[PDB]
Amino acid sequence: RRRSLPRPHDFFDAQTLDAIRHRAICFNLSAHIESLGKGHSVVFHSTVIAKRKEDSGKIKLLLHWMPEDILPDVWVNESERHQLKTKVVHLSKLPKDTALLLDPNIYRTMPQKRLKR
Amino acid sequence: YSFKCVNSLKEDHNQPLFGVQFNWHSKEGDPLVFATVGSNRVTLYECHSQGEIRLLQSYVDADADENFYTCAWTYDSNTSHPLLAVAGSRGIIRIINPITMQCIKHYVGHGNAINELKFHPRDPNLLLSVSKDHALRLWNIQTDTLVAIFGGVEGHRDEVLSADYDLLGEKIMSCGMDHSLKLWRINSKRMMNAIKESYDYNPNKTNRPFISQKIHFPDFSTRDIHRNYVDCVRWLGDLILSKSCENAIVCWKPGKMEDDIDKIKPSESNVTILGRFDYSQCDIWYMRFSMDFWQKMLALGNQVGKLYVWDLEVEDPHKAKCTTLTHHKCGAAIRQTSFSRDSSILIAVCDDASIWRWDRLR
Amino acid sequence: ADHELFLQAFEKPTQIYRFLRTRNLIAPIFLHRTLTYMSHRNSRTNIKRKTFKVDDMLSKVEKMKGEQESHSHLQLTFTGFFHKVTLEVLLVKVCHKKRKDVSCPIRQVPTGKKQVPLNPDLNQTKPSLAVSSNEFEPSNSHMVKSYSLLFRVFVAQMTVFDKNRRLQLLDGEYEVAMQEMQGPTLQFTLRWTLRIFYQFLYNNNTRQQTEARDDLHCPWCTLNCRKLYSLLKHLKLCHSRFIFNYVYHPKGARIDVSINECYDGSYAGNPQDIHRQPGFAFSRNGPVKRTPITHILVCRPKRTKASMSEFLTYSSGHNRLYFHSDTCLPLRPQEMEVDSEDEKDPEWLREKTITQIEEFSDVNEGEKEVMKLWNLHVMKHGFIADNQMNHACMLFVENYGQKIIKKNLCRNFMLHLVSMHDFNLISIMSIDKAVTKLR
Amino acid sequence: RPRLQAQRKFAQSPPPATQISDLSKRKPKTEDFLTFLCLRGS
Amino acid sequence: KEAAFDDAVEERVINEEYKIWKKNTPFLYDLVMTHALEWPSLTAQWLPDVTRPEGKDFSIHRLVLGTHTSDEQNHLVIASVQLPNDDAQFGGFGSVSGKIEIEIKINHEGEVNRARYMPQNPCIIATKTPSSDVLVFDYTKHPSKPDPSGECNPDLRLRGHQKEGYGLSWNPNLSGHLLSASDDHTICLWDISAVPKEGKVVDAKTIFTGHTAVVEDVSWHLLHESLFGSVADDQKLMIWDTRSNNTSKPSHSVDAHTAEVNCLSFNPYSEFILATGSADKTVALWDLRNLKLKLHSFESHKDEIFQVQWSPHNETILASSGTDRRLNVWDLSKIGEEQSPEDAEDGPPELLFIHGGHTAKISDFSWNPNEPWVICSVSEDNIMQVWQMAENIYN
Amino acid sequence: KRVKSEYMRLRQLKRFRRADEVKSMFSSNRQKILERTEILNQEWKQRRIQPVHILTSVSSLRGTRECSVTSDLDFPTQVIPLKTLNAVASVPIMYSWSPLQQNFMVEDETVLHNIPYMGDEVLDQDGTFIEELIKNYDGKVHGDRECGFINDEIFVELVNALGQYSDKIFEAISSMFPDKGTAEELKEKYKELTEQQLPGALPPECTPNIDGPNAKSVQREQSLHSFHTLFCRRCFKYDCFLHPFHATPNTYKRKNTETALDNKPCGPQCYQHLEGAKEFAAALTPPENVEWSGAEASMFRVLIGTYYDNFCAIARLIGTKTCRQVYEFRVKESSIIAPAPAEDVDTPPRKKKRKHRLWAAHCRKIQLKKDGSSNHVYNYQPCDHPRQPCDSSCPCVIAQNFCEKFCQCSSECQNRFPGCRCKAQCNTKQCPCYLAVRECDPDLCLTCGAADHWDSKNVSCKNCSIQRGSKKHLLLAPSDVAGWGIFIKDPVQKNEFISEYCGEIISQDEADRRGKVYDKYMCSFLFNLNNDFVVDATRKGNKIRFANHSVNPNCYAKVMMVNGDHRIGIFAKRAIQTGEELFFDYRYSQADALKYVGIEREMEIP
Amino acid sequence: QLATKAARKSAPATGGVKKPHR
DNA sequence: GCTGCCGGCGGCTGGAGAATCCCGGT
DNA sequence: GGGATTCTCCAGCCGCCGGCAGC
């Protein structure tokens, strides 16, 4: 401890701070984390798309989720209607292969251009 | 020449403005765009007809406690883009490209706050900075090399806060708080070789750093012109204009009447006064007088905000002119004025974060 | 008093840590189950032998039990369009992202074309057919990811198989909605053939207080910290931008937070990057030299037990960017070489010792030039000892013989040598030798 | 007198401790702040 | 453009991540040692030999490294690094002067792509250059101080390739048998048992051109003299049995993963276990008895992978490195173990430890002999890290 | 007086003529201005530049700060979003300084150079500091009460008109104009007006250079007067930059008998081989009238002062005469010259070894008498003793300093330092040079290698580095304590020389004058040197001026005598390895130390 | 005058001499 | 218990001040 | 008789170590 050591000039400049501010604002308006996901969950809004009628007395319907995340389409029985209209899962449970589409700054290959492999 | 207040701008951040400069590099018929400095922000504006002034893009260095006060316009020799140089109390050199909306060059190394920024009239890539460091620096732009340091033993022994460029681009002069008006040369073979080698330096090609030229001895130096802070300088062909806190701009030349500037010996000790310009209420330093491109009129702002306009014609300095362009809201002190590329309009800045526009009606 | 400074200061870390939470949740820097103070996590132990030669039997049994079913070539007929024109049928097959490709390529191959009525209605008809070809092979399917069908008239796309090649499309008549650029829809048939508080103090002038809802969870990274010790350790180790104190509110605990004063967390990579102009800083197009350093962060921690009372790494080498003495420019690693930018003989003072010589009125230039020449000569070496003058004068001759001969100042030079001899620095046996060696 | 005077540059001249929702009030202070109630945690 | 802006933002956030990891490492490791090389290295392997000086609390180990420079003289560097071998001792642990020093430097003919020591004779190591040849160096025959004359003449240089590439491994049971991988779609074999008449030049004895794409891996089955694995950009892993006299017909061929794949390692303590990782962000393993069935897919990576190494002294522990700037530790003993919801949120049970102490793409990593639990890793940020995870993690 | 009124009366016509001149001057200047501006406009006309566009709201910041540029008129206020500039790693404050490897005396500037600028806030309630400073300079600030300016023409006219109706006029001119400030300039102007002529570049006694066409026959003393007066013996430089000119000339004793004096035939035209000249050679102990030029005669007079008998060497140094011609000129002119002095000394004592014991006796006398006030170490000055010995009236003895080789003590002066005798490394207390802190001069300690190997830098002696200036490689970077700092590159062991603290030499009162503003700046460079001089590194010096204070530092400063000069060397208080910042105690008073240096860089360990 | 004294950094040092052998 | 704390304690360093050797002529 | 050659004598310093005030 000492009186006043030099300030190391923190590396996070305001130029990236404003970008982070916009990214957080748009991401919260697109995922409702702090409001509905309790700070740890991304929301998805479904709607009936395809109403398929199977060989037996069963009807399956697609529900497509608005954020268009890594999840693929899933057949849902008509019995589950009005139950999975709004669905909430934790951020860690998204498919790892194409979860980077949620935010470009989640991960990028920093050496995007390489002179050697 | 008669100028009328057609419009007034106030940044309303209540911080003194400095260093207003027109973009004289704009081609014929291009929009009239000039730069102005306020606090940690840099502001550009466009001048339209009928006094309308449009606000252009503005930049802010909010990352640290900063106070900018300088502007200097230059063009990119490669991509023809217009570039702007900004410096502040933090001793930071900033290059802003309004076309790309971003800063793509910055220079550090100055020992203290910068005070005046001016570009070489012939070579756009040579950039000169005036600093509290008690020294002068000339920066290169195509390469990031720095080759000049004007100061030291026989340099200014206190803060330097003004410099001017000759029309031909071969001679600089400096003034500071030490009552000293000092002269520097570029036409010297050593400076020409240094400037040529500045473009011929590749940092990756050689391990040795660039050999920056330290210069401690001005070609001519005098201290008897002013008994106070000499704080702004402009050139008059070979004759020299300089102002101080003695409420009077002085015109003078080195040597005697028949003494040529090229023939001035380094050990010259005799100066020659030429003329005087009179004004009142100049009791505060760091006020600057501006000159048009054609060197035909003189302008100066005052602490009471009154403008002093005099032509540079054959009129004797004793009774050259007496013009006081005033408005009832000019109570704020003026720091610097700017002339358009063809002296058509003039822009002034003040301490109250206000911008004033003056349009000529011949 | 405008509190905007407080707002900005305490907003500065909010964005950084809220972004870091989402960044770490998708991919953590480290496994939080492996942290020492997070012991309630990672309930699994390391006790397991698991000889490898028997894992194959378990894998084979699982594979045998997992042989669920195989796909049945497909045919489909199209019912009339419905709205509140010939149809285009294309099959889209997607391959995995290869090294050369920027993203995952798609192959919208056409299976043919057919005509459809211009928005017909039911009970009016009294039929187009599309058939698939199985000419492909599993070797070709090795590079493919999934399968889907695209229909255009107005574009729709559905997938037939899941990620694990699980069939999602049995045989039956299916109705699908239509999205352009309820509403439009299409029909078709398919057949196979304690309470915690937080206080935000600001210079003791004013403060803002909150309450920790969803207790034992971090307000910033939303980490489940069951124990107060683990919560405080995580806050003081990961959320280092803030300083926290323990107060023990009667509700059970109290944590007063404040912005870190020093927080020596500036740029830690190659220090020369930050000074470089944009477009070259962090270029990463190739290797960037840096002066070697060495830091040890962990050597042998004591590994003490949990201690609530605990709350109330050296470096060797150039750990900073060095600068030029005169120009204050950053010092490149190659510029750190034997060039010490400080030698015995500055040029400015050489110039000054020449300018000040001419100031003396009662000296002729013939002596002034010799004075300047000899001053520069001595300054080039900085002689100190008196015995050097034999060698010093000889080397002065060997250096400036041409200059003095062209200046025609040899007589003034021997006058200078006589002046030296009057000071007992030069012997009489050296003046003649210096003169003889001049020619 | 005038030659020694100080040369001057310028002229002579919250009560509710609501919750950690203050953080959700902090970062998005504008552009559709969430929960519609963090404004009480001003 | 927009790529540069996001690149700068991600550089800042990566620096923040690295600082947070530096602050959290005392509660995560039992040993952390970092040093910045003057030039980045594309190779990281420990020499088998070790010395334990008596009367002090450290032991000296040597690292096999290389130099990758933008524009400078290129060297082969072997560094001596001293490690604390005491539990109660804690300068940092020993002397104050320095823990890492460079002891061997040999001039190079270009970049150092890969370098692997011969296990039987560690004094002779082979290296791969961007050129079409393989260089064999014996540092006992070369001075520590690099000659200013430039490229030093190697003991032997091996021809047979025509393009750059780096997949290397020495024969664990015989001396001089070298199989190497290059982008020429060819794998070349040299016999350096004894070739005095080489004149520093040795041609390939056998050229393997089985794959139709770029091959970047070669590793021997450590319990067989004739079986080795080969990997290609062809998305396949392919095992060759020698003495078959068929450079086109392999012993086996199996489609490994969905994208370009290059890293393969044989478990030292098993006769049939083979594991590999791919650019698909997966690490997968197979059985040599039945190559057509995949045992398991380790899925926690987020980017390309170009190194997989089996941990000595721990057969059931596997580690892999990739461009994700993380070093992962895998434990087969935890396949399919039920875990608490927080443990599941952290990751799969089979993932034992992930290392966050890097700012750039990791080029190579290695587990050392003579020490069961410390790991070195070299990345493209010119930083070298030697680390051991906390003892509380295992046992 | 009415000097201003008379100046204005003459300036009526003077300014009439001046206006006549400056009208043409302005016309010519404007013509050249038109031509130069025409050239510049032509160079500008050839270039096309992309115009700047307005700033559309970037998608990078939906919620950010926007500036509303308002107007006093009816124009609407314009609002635009600010673009955030990228941050730049700045550097600490460091004023310009010239590099310096030696020391530098500054002539005492009795007048204030210029009033420095300050914060413009503290002086609002404590403006008396300016009055205190001007009282320190006693009102002498540059340009004070200048009453305008004089170009030496109006002043000359007033002096000429200032008849008896010299000294009073000179005093009035000095009072009304600080540019002269002395009656010496007024008397010089009076003499110039009375004579209206100048002797030339030579002094009033015209002494042109020998090689010049204006040769003259001048005796040796006047010819070499300039060399003797301006040459500085101590540090081997004409017009010493670290030594005053107030010293005795080269008039001193010398060894007269130091030649073989063997008669030999010095060529065909020799002084010998001639009966008359051979006889005259001993006596002085057909002469042709050769055209002995003035330069030749003056240089013969000079050369006769170094041998007094050797016609061979003198004539060999004469291009215009031979040895026989040298003898003929001797018989012609030097036969009427004054007889040679041929002076010599006795020097009875021969016990050189025993001199150290008596030397130590004088040191013991000093250390027993003046130890109470021994802190007043006085700057060394070479004392000149005309006839008296190195007695209690000797200037060096009263200065309590040993007599260096530049002294005018006898060859065996009891106060003269005889020199160290260490056979090896002499940084131990066994070395006499270390005890009484000094650097082994390279003329006395020949055994320790200080004299030997002056070219190379491999010397066993560790007490001669300051003389050789073999400072280590040091680097500059921002400090971890305050402002800039200095960091050593290579490792250095304990008690090893690293560098010298060079700077400007100034008097105690001048040091106080500079420290008066240094205290206000809160940053100082004043290094106390001795009881007379203070070395200041504010304007010149080297990288070392950045070294920071520390109560527990790793280096120590030592003021040591180096060939009769107070020099400051820095040494490592302990072993220091690569990349460390150097610190030493400033020896400040505790209150002043805490006021000026209040950073410790570390808390208490216990 | 010179009533006030500026603060100068210093480096004090004093030295005796060695006693001869007896 | 253990913290400086301190003075002796032998162990060592290097100046320096005398005891020893040889060459050369008488 | 001198001069080079050793060669111990000494005063001071350095590291260690065993009591001596506290706890």
Author numbering:
A (entry chain P): 179 to 295
B (entry chain L): 80 to 441
C (entry chain A): 81 to 152, 156 to 167, 182 to 223, 228 to 254, 295 to 322, 351 to 362, 426 to 544, 556 to 682
D (entry chain B): 108 to 120, 138 to 166
E (entry chain N): 4 to 93, 106 to 410
F (entry chain C): 17 to 181, 220 to 339, 426 to 746
G (entry chain I): 19 to 40
Study text:
The interaction of PRC2 with substrate nucleosomes involves mainly two structural elements within the catalytic subunit EZH2, the bridge helix and the CXC domain. A central mechanism of PRC2 activation is the recognition of PRC2-trimethylated lysine peptides by its EED subunit, resulting in conformational changes within PRC2 that lead to the allosteric activation of the complex. We discovered that H3K4me3-containing and H3K36me3-containing nucleosomes inhibit PRC2 using two distinct mechanisms because of the differences in their positions along the histone H3 tail.
Analysis of the cryo-EM data of PRC2AJ1–450 bound to the H3K36me3-modified nucleosome resolved two distinct states at 3.1-Å and 3.5-Å resolution, respectively. In the first state, the H3 tail can be seen binding to EZH2 and entering the EZH2 active site (referred to as ‘tail-engaged’), while, in the second state, density for the H3 tail appears absent (referred to as ‘tail-disengaged’). Of notice, in the tail-engaged state, R504 interacts with the backbone of K36 in the histone H3 tail and R497 forms an electrostatic interaction with the backbone of the nucleosomal DNA.
